Amino acid sequence: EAPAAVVTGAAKRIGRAIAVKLHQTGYRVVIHYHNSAEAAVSLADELNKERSNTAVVCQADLTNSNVLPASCEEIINSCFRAFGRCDVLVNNASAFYPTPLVGKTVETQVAELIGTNAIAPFLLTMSFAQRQSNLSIVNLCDAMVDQPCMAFSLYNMGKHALVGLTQSAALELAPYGIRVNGVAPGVSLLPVAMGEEEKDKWRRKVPLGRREASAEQIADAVIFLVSGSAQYITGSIIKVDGGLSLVHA
Amino acid sequence: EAPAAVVTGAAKRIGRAIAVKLHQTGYRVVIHYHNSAEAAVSLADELNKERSNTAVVCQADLTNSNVLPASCEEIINSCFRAFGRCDVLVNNASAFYPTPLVGKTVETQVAELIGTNAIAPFLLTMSFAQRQSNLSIVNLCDAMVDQPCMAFSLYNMGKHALVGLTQSAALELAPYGIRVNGVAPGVSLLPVAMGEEEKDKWRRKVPLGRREASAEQIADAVIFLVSGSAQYITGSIIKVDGGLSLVHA
Amino acid sequence: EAPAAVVTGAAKRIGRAIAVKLHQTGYRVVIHYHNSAEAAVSLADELNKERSNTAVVCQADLTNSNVLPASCEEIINSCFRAFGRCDVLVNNASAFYPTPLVGKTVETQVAELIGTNAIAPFLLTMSFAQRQSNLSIVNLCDAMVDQPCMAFSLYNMGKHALVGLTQSAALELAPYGIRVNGVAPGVSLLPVAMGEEEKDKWRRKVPLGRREASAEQIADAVIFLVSGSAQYITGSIIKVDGGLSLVHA
Amino acid sequence: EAPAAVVTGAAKRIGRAIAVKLHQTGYRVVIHYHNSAEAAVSLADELNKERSNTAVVCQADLTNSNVLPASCEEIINSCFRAFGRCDVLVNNASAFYPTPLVGKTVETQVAELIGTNAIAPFLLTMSFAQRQNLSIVNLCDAMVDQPCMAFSLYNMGKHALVGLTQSAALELAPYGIRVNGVAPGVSLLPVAMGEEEKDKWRRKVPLGRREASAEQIADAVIFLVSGSAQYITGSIIKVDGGLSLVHA
Ligand SMILES: NC(=O)c1ccc[n+]([C@@H]2O[C@H](COP(=O)([O-])OP(=O)(O)OC[C@H]3O[C@@H](n4cnc5c(N)ncnc54)[C@H](OP(=O)(O)O)[C@@H]3O)[C@@H](O)[C@H]2O)c1
Ligand SMILES: NC(=O)c1ccc[n+]([C@@H]2O[C@H](COP(=O)([O-])OP(=O)(O)OC[C@H]3O[C@@H](n4cnc5c(N)ncnc54)[C@H](OP(=O)(O)O)[C@@H]3O)[C@@H](O)[C@H]2O)c1
Ligand SMILES: NC(=O)c1ccc[n+]([C@@H]2O[C@H](COP(=O)([O-])OP(=O)(O)OC[C@H]3O[C@@H](n4cnc5c(N)ncnc54)[C@H](OP(=O)(O)O)[C@@H]3O)[C@@H](O)[C@H]2O)c1
Ligand SMILES: NC(=O)c1ccc[n+]([C@@H]2O[C@H](COP(=O)([O-])OP(=O)(O)OC[C@H]3O[C@@H](n4cnc5c(N)ncnc54)[C@H](OP(=O)(O)O)[C@@H]3O)[C@@H](O)[C@H]2O)c1
Ligand SMILES: Cc1ccc(-c2ccc3nc(N)nc(N)c3c2)cc1
Ligand SMILES: Cc1ccc(-c2ccc3nc(N)nc(N)c3c2)cc1
Ligand SMILES: Cc1ccc(-c2ccc3nc(N)nc(N)c3c2)cc1
Ligand SMILES: Cc1ccc(-c2ccc3nc(N)nc(N)c3c2)cc1
Fold first, then answer.
1. Which residues form the active site (chain D) (predicted)?
2. Do C161 and D156 touch (CB under 8 A)?
3. Homologous superfamily of D1-248 in CATH?
4. Which chains touch A (3 or more CB pairs under 8 A)?
5. At the topology level of CATH, where does B1-249 sit?
6. Which residues of chain D approach chain A closer than 8 Å at the C-beta?
7. What are the extents of the domains in chain B?
8. Which residue in the set A146, A148, A247 is minimally distant from D248, CB to CB?
9. C-alpha distances in Å from residue A214, one per residue of A32, A209, D102
10. Is A36 exposed, middle or buried (0-12, 13-18, 19+ CB in 10 A)?
């Protein structure tokens, strides 16, 4: 029968492309969302039109809190509930915004940026492993972590922690046959609130084609890592950045 | 005027070694502690008998919470209260224990391991910089972050986030003339509860001398980074590991 | 028209598996070899029986010398002579043997280890680019490059230069639409001369499955990197090591 | 008696500052050079004026060839002949020029860039070790993962040097020989480069919008050879003003 995958923040943009490609590959999917209910259900409707009862949605805030472990457990449980199995976890949901060192309170920013990018991946990783073939986890990382955007220290700390989790969980879960890997975009789908001139500044920086990655190109790397063609691969983070991280200042 | 330094978790072990060496170099010191009140007071007494009014203690829990920003702000405030300046911050205090993926609640484990190793350094860094010559911050990292101990994922995530901080904060605070660097021990002071046979198993693995780093050897690298001999150094992490991280399985 | 690929050191082992999978994928192939003449011709025979006129052999020594540039030129030329095009270069051929610091002269050891692992890849890369779809190069690197085997300094130097080449050529050849990537094995096909107790000692070290990578599992990663599913990927090295590089001493 | 150090390419620029600082720390020095005889001799005279019989020059081409192993052995031998001991080796000499992928022949560019940056350090390390606070410091490059366009052989040479630093650290540790690296970002700029282009680069550096002095590079070499770094091996210290942290 068909394997099942959980994709966090799967309603729009990159998580959406990932869930679509996984479904096209033959997976049943849990579309996790926080604020984007309409979009999440729209995607489920589309996927279920293709193959009946192969997509469900699951709401959760992934901000760090007292209830986050229970929320993460429920995300995994919804996959087992809907499909009787959970073969793939994709940690894609992510808050992204500046937190200058020199109005959300700083402790809220910690909760959101560190929660979404690191603690929730950790808790979902725990629950995914506890509840257990070709099982794997794919973490959406960031190819630019060592050359970070100015004033994004919390966001960067979140993504660095996710690298640590990817590595630690690969080592620890290997005995269980659970592989744990990452995909590290450089520039992909650009901010909605970014202006067109600024977009082109960034595009011009990419050696391979002077363009951002499509969400589908990011999804392609996820598809590889979950597949039978990556069965010896664990603890690896694959850059999908058109060479951007190689470009000096 | 003598410069002043804050060392977190400075009552014993490596934090103490760093405070002492800074003091011997001519720094006035804030000895931060959490539980080790007797040892912190004792160390301060010792340093003050060497030079009068050159050391004060400062108690704070560095577990993550909504009050952690205020606590970190107060730690920096206490350096200015005592000495009228704050030249150096050393982020040494650190929780370290296993958190298996498959007692304390996971919420507490997250708060302690991520708070001490990452969030408190980030908040102390904000406060140190907000309050502002040879200014710098040294973060105590871990040379083994890419070959972590089994079942230490939250601890590892915390140390990886600290690397991210070191880099982000080096970039962002360079315009202010604040350098931000790391020292990464491999095996130094062994756990107090560890049996001699287990200690020797680890000692035997170290290429350079088959022994752990002394606390002073760790302090030596910290003292270099804060000195005028490191005035162009920022965003660097110096391994003090005797070659351990180079040794394959 | 079918695309064409050069695989160096393709007569046996991992190189052979790569040549076989490329061919199965629809590529015409140049089977480069040095001494394994019989095995190279035998492979070409096998592949040509499957689809006629889709495989040729090409002999060359890839040791560093003044004629190495011309030899590398001729390898690329042989691909054009046979197939009219050259879409993919796989830098697989590699000398591997200890060279302690404390019958071959050191001059020969340098020429062999640095020539095969670094200079030949570099010269092949020049020639490939100069003769110029989905064009790409895949370099066979080494996951253990930062945790090297004792007394393998020249080999390790070679593999390190190979990473540098992958990055530098990714950046420079991007404007030409040539992607440059790496696949980094941990332990795969074991040395011929190695005895069985020693083989099993190394197998025990691999977290994922306690065994070495098949040559086909290595080839699988090469296949991905050259595919249309990796079209935004350049300057990336994918570890295929079962988590081995994550294991501390 | 005083310890002794060999510094390669020590006649000028960064290697010169390294030799001067080592000398000021109390080392006797072998000032190796290739083409800069007048500058090397001028340095030796300055140092010997300071302390009699504490500096000698040693000429050698560090390009890769059949004779390079013998030349490197002779450089180490020179330190023993002058001073009776060799405590420190600094691998500083380096060829640096573009080699685009698309009058020197490429085999000569390989020989010069790979020989000076990698093979010569390896042979020198062998010779240094066969003869034995002992340490080796290799001059690396902080920008090796964000390389300059069309510098592939140079970049290959420096990556090879990181491999050597790690491999030799591991292998010579049982002998009490530590092996480390100093990785400048931008330090002393080419003499020929117009100020307009120098300042373009200077402005990229987060920490003070300037290049490293040769003396600041030397300071990190001085730390690594000192008693203060006695547990440090296989480490490479960036001295780059934050440059490698700056995205495109
Ligand atoms: N886009 C890029 O150029 C780029 C570059 C580097 C790395 N990446 C990584 O790739 C991944 C996807 O990128 P993206 O641009 O598609 O992401 P995105 O648009 O910024 O966000 C993806 C989703 O994250 C979910 N999310 C945010 N905060 C949440 C919270 N507190 N709780 C639960 N869910 C939350 C949101 O779901 P709802 O809409 O349902 O609220 C959002 O739609 C991220 O991990 C990102 O860091 C992207
Ligand atoms: N020891 C090693 O071999 C080694 C290896 C790698 C890295 N390191 C790094 O080097 C640094 C020092 O090592 P160490 O072994 O000396 O450290 P440690 O003894 O394990 O901890 C140092 C201090 O951290 C403080 N701390 C713990 N939890 C705290 C909390 N919730 N709030 C405030 N303070 C808290 C404690 O202060 P109180 O005693 O006052 O409660 C403790 O004395 C650490 O950052 C460590 O990660 C050490
Ligand atoms: N566990 C592993 O096997 C492992 C681990 C890490 C990395 N890797 C990397 O993966 C690749 C394949 O591994 P492998 O074990 O299959 O390699 P290998 O069998 O040791 O060597 C591959 C071929 O390289 C060719 N070669 C050697 N010296 C040459 C020279 N001077 N000139 C021209 N060709 C020469 C030989 O060709 P002829 O037989 O025709 O003479 C040989 O068959 C290598 O790059 C290796 O470094 C392998
Ligand atoms: N300058 C920078 O911004 C920078 C940046 C990153 C890394 N670094 C590293 O720091 C080190 C010092 O840099 P630098 O700018 O001072 O170096 P440099 O001036 O470019 O070269 C130093 C010396 O290397 C010697 N050399 C060149 N080719 C040689 C050969 N074939 N055989 C023997 N010696 C040869 C030359 O000696 P003669 O003059 O006697 O012929 C030259 O003076 C180098 O390893 C370099 O890669 C420097
Ligand atoms: C030029 C440029 C391209 C893409 C983004 C960008 C947009 C959204 C976004 N979301 C996120 N959770 N994480 C990111 N790293 C991210 C990055 C920003 C700037
Ligand atoms: C063999 C061995 C050597 C040293 C430690 C060790 C002891 C205490 C300790 N505290 C800490 N905050 N962080 C560490 N990384 C740490 C590590 C553990 C095991
Ligand atoms: C345990 C163990 C597994 C595999 C090899 C091994 C065998 C052949 C081999 N060839 C080569 N060109 N490069 C390597 N790194 C290599 C490695 C050595 C030791
Ligand atoms: C802008 C700019 C910055 C630094 C150099 C520079 C000058 C000389 C130089 N020599 C050398 N052996 N290695 C280098 N990496 C180097 C670099 C050149 C141009």
1. 141, 154
2. yes
3. NAD(P)-binding Rossmann-like Domain (3.40.50.720)
4. B, C, D
5. Rossmann fold (3.40.50)
6. 143, 145-148, 204, 243-248
7. 1-249
8. A247
9. 21, 12, 29
10. buried
